[model samples]
Target: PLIVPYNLPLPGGVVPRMLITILGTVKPNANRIALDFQRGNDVAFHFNPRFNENNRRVIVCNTKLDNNWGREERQSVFPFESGKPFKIQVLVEPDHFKVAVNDAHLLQYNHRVKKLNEISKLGISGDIDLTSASYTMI
Candidate 1:
């Protein structure tokens, strides 16, 4: 697991791209894993490591505008990973992003960031093993 400073709070409704760097070994075909934030039933995307594009590693976001909060909207694809630590650049805009992992990974989200008061926390999780992670405002 990765540890982040408590002062690094994400602004509500402001999309920020993250550069996830995996430091540990991951399974060849692990279940989908991600970094996310939650406030009650509101689940927000932070990162996913098992996504693939054209059969390659990838990241995805909202499926459609109408489904931003629904399961249908929470989909993505990306493809880029090196055996060592690699960088995934995601374009988080408000609620979602033109998400890209490493260099090959790609996907998009449907919703824009909510009001500043809506989001309260951030964190990471995934099916594949990870060693370290970091994020920055885009």
Candidate 2:
């Protein structure tokens, strides 16, 4: 079972050790894709992969606050190939979130807000096709 990026809510908000799994395929001729973990109006984390931005194909990570974007982290090992499926898992630790790509460690994003329980929503948007956006509270 899979839910498109329309809208998915994480019931009971997020616990300290929750796991989020997103399964999807990259679109051919894709431009970029973004995953946002939000709490009310505050964005705790923003995970973005740009395939065509300046032709650099880097992943940008950052946070949003008060409708403002902070300094972006545009350092990625590499972007996923276009027209291919990917498994991106984000584990909510007490202090940071760990991201794994295809079961391999990709990167970690420290909690800028440090309040994981407030992050209540998951948003997926960009030029990509998704199969699943599942969350498991642990």
Candidate 3:
């Protein structure tokens, strides 16, 4: 059976022109969820979505290097709803990641650490039941 806090290692590291897909359902009372693309101990990209943040919903994106987090980029258009199923697609472009939820464009997070080839691990955690996670070269 699949479990939360899942860590999947990509046989090939992240590269330009790749499409990553995640399917899951938010818990009824879930507060947030996180997805991370990591290289060893460094996080190349951190995608977070919050359901209740000071009475507002938001998406936080960032990078972490040397155990320190970078300045967070916030998006105001929250797509997923509590207790509902959602689809998230992350298109790996040459300069940034194009994220979309439920077939709608969400946000784009630019490459920070600049070594996308080392980002071979994808970590998923927090407040949801994961149905599927897949990637395809495009």
Candidate 4:
């Protein structure tokens, strides 16, 4: 997630560790991360500035390599731009990393890391203000 203290420009390829807390009414939705089978295993989370939506957002999981590209899943309408802060949570399991955003959607990358123990990295990007973020082993 990205947090802006000022309107200053943010550098690329920079990764920060954020502490995310589950708050009221949103706790149940955020807790879905626990439902992920790959929690704390081989999955990782990261943000890509180049990939984003304007009015639609999508969450995908257990998908094949051919479907990894955003173009393949055209149902999402969220905008991807700089200066917007969004949350990304990755759960590394034995076969894939389940990715979630703002506790609202999920995506799965099955071909990236078929094994649960091969993941160890996270990334972030965009232009939004991020309050907090975190990943836990379930």
The lDDT for every candidate, in the order shown, is 0.46, 0.83, 0.91, 0.33
Please give, for residues 76-113, the per-residue lDDT of candidate 4 as tens digits: 43323333444555544445444555675445545443
Considering TM-score, where higher is better, how would the candidates rank from best to worst?
3, 2, 1, 4
Candidate 2, superposed: residue stretches over 4 Å from native: 1-4
Q: Write down the worst ten-residue block by lDDT for model 1.
A: 58-67
Tens digit of per-residue lDDT, candidate 2, span 38-66: 98888889999888776678989999999
1 against 3, candidate with superior lDDT: 3
lDDT of 4 at 2: 29
lDDT-superior candidate, 2 or 3: 3
Tell me which of candidates 1 and 3 scores higher on TM-score.
Answer: 3
Residue pairs that clash (backbone atoms under 3 angstroms), model 3: none
Cα TM-score per model: 0.53, 0.92, 0.97, 0.38
Clashing pairs in 2: none
Query: What TM value does model 2 have?
Result: 0.92
Best model per lDDT? 3
lDDT of 1 by residue, 44-77 (tens): 4545554454565544342212335445343433
- Residue 12, candidate 1: Cα error in Å is 6.4
**Pairwise TM-score winner, candidates 2 and 3:** 3
For model 4, the superposed segments whose C-alpha errors exceed 4 Å read 1-86, 114-118
N/CA/C clash count, model 2: 0
